[PDB]
Amino acid sequence: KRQWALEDFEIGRPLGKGKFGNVYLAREKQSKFILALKVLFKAQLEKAGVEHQLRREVEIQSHLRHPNILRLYGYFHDATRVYLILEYAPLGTVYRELQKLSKFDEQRTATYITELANALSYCHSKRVIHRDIKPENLLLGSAGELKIADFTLDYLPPEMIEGRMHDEKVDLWSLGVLCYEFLVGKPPFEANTYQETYKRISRVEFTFPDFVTEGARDLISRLLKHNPSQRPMLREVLEHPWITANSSKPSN
């Protein structure tokens, strides 16, 4: 628990826009340690009323330690800005990869889905749910392993948008959404308006291109049920035939 300050860093390349400022490559002066520094404006956190949402997410994200979860090393603030000290993820966002490749093969998808599920299984067994399990929020390590970070309906389950009660089953719906997007190149409830997307999610209307294989259709269909109780456990996902046939890493 070292209290940091901006003078302890040399800032570099902008890595991305985080909607609340920007994330920069940085290097710790004393150690030479390379990391990522998320720069948030304090005036924009008050006036989006998320200062609690930040404090609790930072608390949670600091204690969690998994190879497929991006490490938060710490934080500090000055007058204007708050700084998150993050692991640096050399290979960037899954979003960008998907923009590049347009879509992913079954192997890369099934691997990603494993890595997610693993990091979620761990998350659940500390009573942590997530909401924004979306490509903008998944990063890639030097080995190209998936890392979850950043603790718009497109990825939200029916119970959530409807305003119903929700449990750890939200994250299962997310996996189905992502599994679909990874294979097809767009999420399954995509639309041109919010209102429509809302309808699509709420009545669970999705269809498959021809090229999506029977095994993947099975797993996605299983994951995207309206009824949370009907969605499989994470263990079952890791042990799905399509997953085990196509993944590269193993389940845990």
Ligand SMILES: O=C1CCCc2cc(-c3ccnc(Nc4ccccc4)n3)ccc2N1
């Ligand atoms: O939600 C978002 C939108 C997407 C941009 C973004 C990126 C990071 C981040 C954290 C650690 N390593 C990296 N490496 C990286 C490497 C190459 C390209 C881009 C990012 N990037 C954190 C938060 C964040 N904000």
